[PDB]
Amino acid sequence: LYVGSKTKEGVVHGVATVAEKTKEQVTNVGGAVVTGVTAVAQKTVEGAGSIAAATGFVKKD
Amino acid sequence: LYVGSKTKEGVVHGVATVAEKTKEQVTNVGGAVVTGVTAVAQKTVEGAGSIAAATGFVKKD
Amino acid sequence: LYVGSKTKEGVVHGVATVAEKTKEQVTNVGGAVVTGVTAVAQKTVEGAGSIAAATGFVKKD
Amino acid sequence: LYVGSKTKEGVVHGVATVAEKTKEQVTNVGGAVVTGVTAVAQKTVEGAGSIAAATGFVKKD
Amino acid sequence: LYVGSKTKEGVVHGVATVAEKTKEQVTNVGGAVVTGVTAVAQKTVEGAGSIAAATGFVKKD
Amino acid sequence: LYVGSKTKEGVVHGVATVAEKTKEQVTNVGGAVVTGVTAVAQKTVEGAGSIAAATGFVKKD
Numbered sequence: 001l002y003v004g005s006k007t008k009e010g011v012v013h014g015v016a017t018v019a020e021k022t023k024e025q026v027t028n029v030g031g032a033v034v035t036g037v038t039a040v041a042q043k044t045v046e047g048a049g050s051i052a053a054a055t056g057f058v059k060k061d
Numbered sequence: 062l063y064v065g066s067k068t069k070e071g072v073v074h075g076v077a078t079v080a081e082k083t084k085e086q087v088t089n090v091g092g093a094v095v096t097g098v099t100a101v102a103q104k105t106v107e108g109a110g111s112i113a114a115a116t117g118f119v120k121k122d
Numbered sequence: 123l124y125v126g127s128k129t130k131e132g133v134v135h136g137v138a139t140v141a142e143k144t145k146e147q148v149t150n151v152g153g154a155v156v157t158g159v160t161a162v163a164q165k166t167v168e169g170a171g172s173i174a175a176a177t178g179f180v181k182k183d
Numbered sequence: 184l185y186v187g188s189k190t191k192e193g194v195v196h197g198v199a200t201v202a203e204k205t206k207e208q209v210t211n212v213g214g215a216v217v218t219g220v221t222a223v224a225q226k227t228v229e230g231a232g233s234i235a236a237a238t239g240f241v242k243k244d
Numbered sequence: 245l246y247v248g249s250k251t252k253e254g255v256v257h258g259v260a261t262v263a264e265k266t267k268e269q270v271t272n273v274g275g276a277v278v279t280g281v282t283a284v285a286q287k288t289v290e291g292a293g294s295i296a297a298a299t300g301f302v303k304k305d
Numbered sequence: 306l307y308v309g310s311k312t313k314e315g316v317v318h319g320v321a322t323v324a325e326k327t328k329e330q331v332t333n334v335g336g337a338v339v340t341g342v343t344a345v346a347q348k349t350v351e352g353a354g355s356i357a358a359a360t361g362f363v364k365k366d
């Protein structure tokens with residue numbers, strides 16, 4: 001009897017954001033850039049979970 | 062008896078965003094750039110979950 | 123009898139953010155840059171969880 | 184020579200707002216109620232200016 | 245020669261607001277209530293300026 | 306020669322606000338209530354300026 005109803009798991013609510021940038025410049029040469037990740041919710045059952053992961057390079061040879 | 066109703070899992074609600082950029086420039090030479098990810102919800106059952114993942118390059122030879 | 127209802131696990135709510143940058147510049151040469159991660163919630167059952175992870179490079183040869 | 188160009192007078196820009204109210208109730212009996220005034224700009228030349236003014240009653244007899 | 249350009253007078257910019265009220269109730273009997281005034285800009289030349297003014301009642305008889 | 310450009314007079318910028326009220330109640334009987342005034346800018350030339358003024362009542366008879 002899981003009558004307990006209001007289960008909130010991995011929830012994002014009530015967000016307000018403002019950004020004012022006169023000049024935004026990104027230069028990437030053989031790498032990884034992750035910019036501006038906002039209001040991201042995730043719920044993973046029996047698995048991994050990755051948010052905003054940046055890896056330059058994996059050689060593995 | 063899972064009478065517990067209001068189950069919220071991986072939910073995003075009530076978001077307000079403003080962006081004012083006079084000049085946004087992105088230069089990419091052989092890499093990965095991820096910009097501006099907003100209000101993303103995900104729910105994965107028995108699997109992985111990735112949001113805004115940037116990998117430069119995987120050689121593996 | 124899990125009548126205990128209001129379970130909040132991995133929740134982000136009620137956030138306000140303001141950013142004013144006259145000039146934002148990012149230069150990346152063979153690495154990993156993670157900038158501006160805001161209001162991220164995650165709930166992982168029986169798995170790993172990574173948020174805003176930056177790895178330069180993994181050679182492993 | 185008023186070459187000075189960028190004149191901003193009575194300006195509102197870059198606003199983000201979120202409101203979550205499970206129950207909002209207003210009861211008024213012979214009065215004045217002003218609720219929820221957001222992002223209002225005004226520019227009056229040679230005159231008065233009023234924003235969100237509430238007056239109960241003016242008898243003046 | 246008013247070459248001075250960037251004149252900001254009565255300006256509101258870059259605002260973020262969040263409100264979470266489970267129950268908001270207002271009861272008014274012959275008066276004045278002013279609630280929730282946000283991000284209001286005003287510029288008055290040769291005149292008065294009033295923002296969020298509440299007057300109960302003016303008899304003046 | 307008023308080459309001096311960047312004149313900021315009566316400016317409000319870069320504000321972040323959060324409010325969490327489980328119950329807000331206002332009862333008014335023949336008076337004036339002013340609640341929640343945020344991020345208000347005003348610039349008055351040759352005149353008065355009033356922000357969030359509450360007067361109960363003016364009899365003046």
Ligand SMILES: [C]N1=C(/[C]=[C]/[C]=C2\[C]=[C]N([C][C][O])C3=[C][C]=[C][C]=C32)SC2=C1[C]=[C][C]=[C]2
Pocket residue numbers: 029030031090091092118
């Ligand atoms: C430019 N780059 C490079 C460069 C490189 C260089 C090098 C490498 C290596 N080495 C040794 C071993 O590793 C060297 C050496 C010397 C010089 C240079 C170099 S790599 C890539 C790019 C771009 C895009 C993508 C990718």
Ligand SMILES: [C]N1=C(/[C]=[C]/[C]=C2\[C]=[C]N([C][C][O])C3=[C][C]=[C][C]=C32)SC2=C1[C]=[C][C]=[C]2
Pocket residue numbers: 048049050114115116119170171172
């Ligand atoms: C992105 N990526 C990845 C990613 C990955 C991630 C991961 C892995 C593993 N793990 C362990 C656990 O199961 C993890 C964990 C957590 C998160 C993530 C992850 S791998 C590859 C890519 C791209 C291209 C190619 C290849």
Ligand SMILES: [C]N1=C(/[C]=[C]/[C]=C2\[C]=[C]N([C][C][O])C3=[C][C]=[C][C]=C32)SC2=C1[C]=[C][C]=[C]2
Pocket residue numbers: 002007063068
């Ligand atoms: C008992 N348990 C569980 C249980 C669980 C249950 C559940 C989960 C999930 N879900 C989804 C929704 O929220 C559900 C649902 C309903 C009922 C129950 C449940 S988990 C674990 C244990 C023990 C030991 C270790 C681990």
Ligand SMILES: [C]N1=C(/[C]=[C]/[C]=C2\[C]=[C]N([C][C][O])C3=[C][C]=[C][C]=C32)SC2=C1[C]=[C][C]=[C]2
Pocket residue numbers: 185190246251
């Ligand atoms: C000289 N003055 C002035 C001057 C003024 C000018 C002006 C004003 C306004 N505006 C509008 C726009 O911002 C203008 C404009 C242009 C030029 C000038 C001016 S004011 C006064 C004096 C003296 C004594 C006292 C007072």
Ligand SMILES: [C]N1=C(/[C]=[C]/[C]=C2\[C]=[C]N([C][C][O])C3=[C][C]=[C][C]=C32)SC2=C1[C]=[C][C]=[C]2
Pocket residue numbers: 212213214240273274275
């Ligand atoms: C209720 N109410 C009133 C009430 C009143 C009462 C009174 C008055 C006056 N007195 C004396 C002289 O003034 C009196 C006296 C005793 C009791 C009461 C009263 S007023 C009005 C209302 C409502 C709405 C609107 C307006």
Ligand SMILES: [C]N1=C(/[C]=[C]/[C]=C2\[C]=[C]N([C][C][O])C3=[C][C]=[C][C]=C32)SC2=C1[C]=[C][C]=[C]2
Pocket residue numbers: 236237238241292293294353354355
């Ligand atoms: C609102 N109100 C008013 C308001 C008023 C305001 C004012 C007056 C005067 N003053 C002096 C200067 O010129 C002022 C000033 C400042 C602000 C406001 C005001 S009056 C009446 C009403 C309603 C109904 C009936 C009557």
